[PDB]
């Protein structure tokens, strides 16, 4: 019944999520106690006004130098609006904010006064500011006198030929084509570094950057003598940048005065996420050697500012290093990741089906797991300052909660003590577990033999008893599910279903061999893995084999279609979001053409031409080949403005199915682009999916 | 030079102002220390975006029960937007907010979640919510299950005769006239009490209110058995309500269920600002006996809820009670004004030219001054909870600052200790003093003999030396200047001028005799008082008698025009804002017609008719009579949408002066109504005034 | 349209005869165009096969379609080119021109591209039509 | 010019034309209703 589903959706979506945190300066009282403040940003979904609202909250922590004595709240929640970026000064006395209230303003606050405000639009020195997580940045000087950020390059003015003038500007150039960076990057062509002087108020665009690189993720060099940034190559043409770490880039340093850029790394592989040590003597960054896959295991590299020597701290892990580490599969290090002594780095990464926090000693090279053991969970580090770590913890049956802790001395990280700041009420209805699956001998290649995969099973606890099941493979194909808080699986579990999330071979967190085993075999290996997992779960758990449903999006939807074509007597429903149907036709219309070439089994090369062999191979691997066998009812959700997967892919499948009189229902959202992240769109899609599954099962 | 003036205006206007404060619940730590949080709201002027911005800040206070041990900040400032009203729950665990984000929403917050949100517009049970300080309110139940507020009454739907219908609503009634409440109250005709249930979400409009009274300022009765409110009479027609305490009203109580209103006071005089004691056994309110003047000295009345007995705590003060008290001249008591034991009431009031805090013991009746002595200043109480007072302090040479303190036991209030929370940097350039003036024997009436008045003198310290002077009389005529932070006088002092603010006989804070001495003598008494003050100051201080200027608004412009007409060889410039020129023509076009009748010397009665004597008396007292003698250059600023003083008053004077070829400059703002409170309008007017004065002097 | 198809074929097969070329919403790759246009039967009829609903991609049909497209001759183009495209086109999707533009630019050939975000297929808006005609005339005069 | 038309009757009392078909009204699940 729709009413119960709507009430349940309201109740479940009433849970907030944490997004950021920063620490304030230390304070000493006359009595002797020492305390400091913690700032946190939360986001929530409001259905009445249909929007994502953000608020800021503050907490107080009393410590004794190496132990947390007390922790409490410090007021109520305040809702903000129009905040794009913010950054506290190194000394914690001023705050810089970017606000879009439309024009963009830069604001400097101190104590209970807005010290200064600049209208960037009026100055007319650049375009809109980059507020994303790929190029955007906002950095202070060590002297706290200048600000550094990135903004779109300025375009020359143009006008039409037949424009009257009162009784300069290029004529006929107002419709030139400027290439952007792909999905969710519309109108973002070429960024530039901008330096602003707080005292006077003069903005300057740095000169010296190479003419064929887009700069980003910059910070001031030691001594405020220059700027260090990461340059992405955009020649001969731009490729997709979202969720893709295999884009050529390098690390550069340029002086404030006019000069020549200096190279600090190798200009043949991918690099990203540089961080400067507290003592201003070394840098650490992430390096990805190969450009074939869009997501892989990376290396941690160290660079010494004075000796100019580069070394490798953490290398590639083929299968498993020890029994607690599997490699670095993240793409961004925390803004604060250095310990006080400037000898250790703390980060987080996926291990198997969970997410853990690790500490690395840049001197020796050992990696220690802080959250090893237990039943599992999802940890996320938000910041570390003077050996005080702030983290978020969540599980499939417990919404996010906040915690703080002190990093123990060297050689004792396995004894960290956590103190709760904000806790969430668990749901005792949901029970979750992990299943390990070993592929049968036939479905194994000689090159990589002995690999296994996993699945996460969610079921209603305390059941009387045949139960229906819903199976979800993830997108990617280089991604994975972690034992964190997920809304829709929780709703399905609370509505009476049993959810099975599959992590097939080729997912992140299982080693480099699993990553490299998939490419070239898409279409038969992962599909058979999912089928084997479903068969084993059905045989063991003793569920209701007559009621099984599928659900997936993007590549997962791809997989979903294949299943309902190859095993048409196993599933009784299917829901898909922006699926991939025909690779051959998709190659010439997407923003990441190398994806199709890599997945099919060939090598991407600029100035490629359509060959018969390549097209035949691509067509042989597409689910459309099995269309005349589909028999299960289908629900399709498409976003018209999608740029990663064009929406005609679903239209071809819809036409093919409808021509044969098969029950198919289609929904098209004219504005949603790829993720259907708008509150209204997401709510409507989820409600439709739940209603469809309940009606058919 | 305009550039220096603009820079000085920026620097001076960069100062924020405090507007509210509330206290959080008490917290106890394991060690034993006790602390609590303080919430403050600040407002500031931003010239880049030309708007008044509001932010919220929080502080931490550690105490020991009767002494403040420590006080510190608790984070940064957060800018809000769209907040109309807010109110913390009695237990300090939830917060209710009204937001205009256009529709209006009611939000309930708890911890780090927006617990609930209601869209009042969709429910369609009333009109826009009253967010002003005359009728608006937002109250919680003692059980914390219901909310009470006030909203506009619902109007029946209407439609035109020639309206097509698809192939109920009164026809021809869409242009009926609904009378509003006057200045700054456009579209506010008839409020109604609304009660909302948080659990379910059903709104109800209370029934039982008299058909001829507008209700407001309501709160829940003890035991949540009903509602207590103040009803203003709006028959036969409405009069102005802004800055007017002589409007007939009474105090009513009505049960939640359908019933008859019960009267709790006398329905012949003015009443306002009721407050309920912490123990829920008594109420205290302000009563104004007479309706003649728009501002006068009031009485403090006490009502016992169980014995149903009314008594007078603080009565009228003719001239002076002791040497530290002069009467209650305020119009609103603080939301929290009761001491913990429910025996004492703390408020603030103007004493002479300063503002002080007083404590009254409702048992005996004694009044004690907490801030007696010293050189002077301006104090403002914001809230008291469990004997913890939060106050604002300011002076003419020191912007506002915040302080907290503990109320001492009974009989020891003269030993309060203040602790600073936010302090402001003083300006050592400005020096201020107070002058006392005794009128000469001729300018005294037999009825009130022996009265005197005062002036505030601001001059640049450390001057080499003849100095120009600017003279300012206040509006009202029942108001006064207090030694607080004022922007424009500070700017004039810092630009080289000497400012003289006059408090002539008839101002508030000098007793009831001074209040009653003015009415009927407007035109010759106050003008002569100002002239005498100027003469005495010039003779004593040895200023530059050749350069003296005038500045005033409203009644101030009235006095300025009288001065420049009757004494045309004393002033060399004049600037006026929305002045009063002709009372006879103003009577029939303003929203407070009783003002003219009272000031002229007659009694106001509804259904009055124009008599020759009244019109002759009104014309004899107007500055226009002296127009053919004016010789000083004049600057006029007018607001077209003014409803208190129609803007044709200035136009008549402008035409009369221009017809004789006198230097006159006029500025008209199409949108500003009476106070020119818009940031752009205020800045432009102030800059024009300063430039005019500098150019002519 | 089809005129651009023929023009690209001409400038590819005979690269020593023409000194300039201007095209509006051309057809470049029939195989990729089949699954994205509003008249799929056009490609089937022109290629030489019969159109039938519920059709499936066969190797022979795709090979025949690819053999007849001007893209095959891209690595021989030598003449300067001007492209005008309408983003909201539904008869000929605008990626057809983008593929040719990328192929030509990868080899450092003088190419100029104009994209109109709103014009659909005919560029019938007065501003769009005037701008396109002026650009074409200026290009031809400059190169010839 | 493909479907549009506007025709008179021979008696000049009626008019005939063509217009888009009417669609049923729809609303979201989380839509508030008047109380």
Numbering used by the authors:
A (entry chain C), B (entry chain A): 9 to 109, 117 to 182, 199 to 495, 498 to 730
C (entry chain B): 587 to 730
D (entry chain B): 148 to 182
From the article:
The pAPEH—dimethoxy‐phosphate (DMP) complex was created by adding dichlorvos (DDVP), an organophosphate insecticide, to pAPEH. The structure of the complex was determined by cryo‐EM to 2.65 Å maximal resolution, in D2 symmetry. Dimethoxy‐phosphate (DMP) residue of dichlorvos is bound covalently to the active Ser587 (Oγ‐P1) of APEH. The free oxygen of the phosphate (P1‐O1 moiety) is fixed and oriented by the oxyanion site. Here—in contrast to the pAPEH‐AcAMHK complex—one H‐bond is actually formed with the oxyanion‐loop (with the amide NH of Gly509), while the other interaction partner (the amide NH of His588) is still too far for a strong association. One of the methoxy groups is positioned within the S1 binding pocket. Compared to ligand‐free pAPEH, the shift of the oxyanion‐ and the His‐loops can be seen: the oxyanion‐loop moves closer to the inhibitor with the backbone N and Cα of Gly509 shifting by 0.6 and 0.7 Å, respectively, in similar way to that seen in the pAPEH‐AcAMHK complex, however, the catalytic His‐loop moved in the opposite direction (by 0.8 Å measured between His707(Cα)s), shifting away from the catalytic center. We found DMP bound in a non‐aged form—meaning that it retains both of its methoxy substituents. Aging is the spontaneous dealkylation process that often occurs in organophosphates bound to serine proteases, where the gradual loss of the O‐alkyl (or N‐alkyl) groups increases the irreversibly bound nature of the complex. On the other hand, surprisingly, through this very same sensitivity toward the OPs, APEH has also become a potential target for cognitive enhancing drugs promoting synaptic plasticity and learning in young brains (García‐Rojo et al., 2017; Sandoval et al., 2012). Both developing sensitive and specific monitoring systems and attempting to design nontoxic but effective inhibitors of APEH require a precise understanding of the mode and requirements of the binding process—the structure of the pAPEH‐OP complex presented here can be utilized toward these goals.
Acylpeptide hydrolase (APEH) or acylaminoacyl‐peptidase (AAP) is a serine hydrolase that regulates protein metabolism. It can also bind to and process unusual substrates, acting as a detoxifier. The most prominent physiological function of APEH is the removal of N‐acetylated amino acids from the N‐terminus of oligopeptides and proteins (Perrier et al., 2005) thereby exerting crucial control over the proteasomal degradation of damaged and misfolded proteins (Adibekian et al., 2011; Hoernstein et al., 2023; Hwang et al., 2010; Palmieri et al., 2011; Sandomenico et al., 2021; Shimizu et al., 2003; Shimizu et al., 2004; Tangri et al., 2021). The S9 serine protease subfamily, the so‐called oligopeptidases, employs a further, size‐based selection process (Kobayashi & Smith, 1987). Their active site is sequestered in an inner pocket that is formed between the catalytic hydrolase domain and a propeller domain that caps it.
